[PDB]
From a paper:
In the present study, we showed that DR_0354 protein (DrXth), the exonuclease III homolog, possesses AP endonuclease, 3′-phosphodiesterase, 3′-phosphatase, and 3′–5′-exonuclease activities. In the present study, we characterized the unique ExoIII family AP endonuclease DrXth from [name], which is widely distributed in Deinococcus species. The endonuclease and exonuclease activities of DrXth prefer Mg2+ and Mn2+, respectively.
The fully active, N-terminal truncated enzyme containing residues 23–283 (NΔ22DrXth) was purified and crystallized. The overall structure of DrXth is composed of 12 β-sheets surrounded by 9 α-helices, forming a two-layer structure core. Distribution of the electrostatic surface potential of DrXth revealed a central active site pocket with a negatively charged groove surrounded by a positively charged surface, which corresponds to divalent metal ion and DNA binding sites, respectively, as observed in the structures of other AP endonucleases. However, different from these bacterial ExoIII type proteins, DrXth possessed the N-terminal region similar to APE1. Additionally, the loop region connecting α3 and β3 displayed a noticeable deviation due to the lack of five residues between Pro80 and Gly81. The catalytic residues in the active site, namely Asn41, Asn43, Glu69, Asp177, Asn179, Asp248, Asp270, and His271, were superimposed with equivalent residues in the structures of other AP endonucleases. Based on the structure of DrXth, mutation of Gly198 to His or Ala was likely to prevent the enzyme from flipping out the abasic ribose.
Residue numbers in the entry: 33 to 281
Write the structure that this text describes.
């Protein structure tokens, strides 16, 4: 049967656990869990019944990604390789049930010119890595915080953010090209034209008013991921878990 896959930027795994992440996992039982912004050193006992692969950043409390699964992992790959993205613990992958699952955390450029230029540069290198992965031809599912909203429908305040990191013209164009290289935006496919977000700031009732951005993605090639929605029944981090069904063949 199909596998339930969840991608989730936890904003610090220990913080998410304190808010109830293990309880959410106990109830929802994703077959594959792709985590971003783990921050912590590996915590293989945190979610009972899950095998885990961890790729922490060099800096304490910073970035870090992980893949957890109820089925055994195969060919765990830590990093790309890429000097800076590996130092920041931003990409991990493993094969589960014949599908290459990748957990990716792309950098924010919000802090200023320095990190925006970093983001622009490493996203070209990340695109090269993804395109080579697609040319290999094995089925792939990417769960990632990309820190990019694609179209106007993807953020409530689009008119006020066309000059802000995450919605800059070249970043929207990058996302179009990312999908055109051979990836389906599974949440958008499942939503049609409906608006749904994956991140809300902690400032000024933004979560309750649904003033959000869609910056987390489930992207697929060679396999369909259906039923994808954000889960807003919990507030385990600034993001919502994004979950759907991977229709294995």
């Amino acid at each position: 049967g199909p596998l339930k896959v969840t991608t989730f930027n936890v904003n610090g795994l220990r913080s998410a656990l304190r808010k109830g992440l293990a309880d959410w996992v106990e109830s929802n039982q994703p077959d594959v869990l792709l985590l971003q912004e783990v921050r912590a050193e590996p915590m293989p006992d945190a979610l009972p019944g899950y095998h885990s692969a961890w790729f922490p950043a060099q800096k304490a409390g910073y970035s870090g990604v992980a893949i957890l699964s109820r089925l055994p992992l195969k060919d765990v790959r830590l990093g790309m390789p890429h000097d800076e993205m590996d130092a920041e613990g931003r990409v991990v992958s493993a094969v589960v049930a014949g599908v290459r699952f990748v957990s990716v955390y792309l950098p924010s450029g919000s802090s200023g010119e320095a990190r925006q230029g970093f983001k622009d540069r490493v996203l070209a290198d990340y695109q090269a890595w993804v395109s080579e992965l697609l040319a290999a031809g094995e089925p792939v599912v990417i769960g990632g915080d990309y820190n990019i909203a694609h179209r106007e429908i993807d953020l409530k305040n689009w008119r006020s953010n066309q000059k802000n990191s995450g919605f800059l013209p070249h970043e929207r164009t990058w996302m179009t090209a990312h999908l055109a290289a051979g990836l389906v935006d599974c949440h958008r496919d499942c939503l049609g034209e409906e608006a749904e977000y994956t991140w809300w700031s902690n400032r000024a009732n933004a979560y309750a008013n649904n003033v959000g951005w869609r910056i987390d993605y489930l992207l697929s090639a060679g396999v369909r991921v259906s039923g994808v929605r954000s889960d807003r029944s919990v507030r385990l981090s600034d993001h919502a878990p994004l979950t759907g069904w991977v229709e294995l063949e």
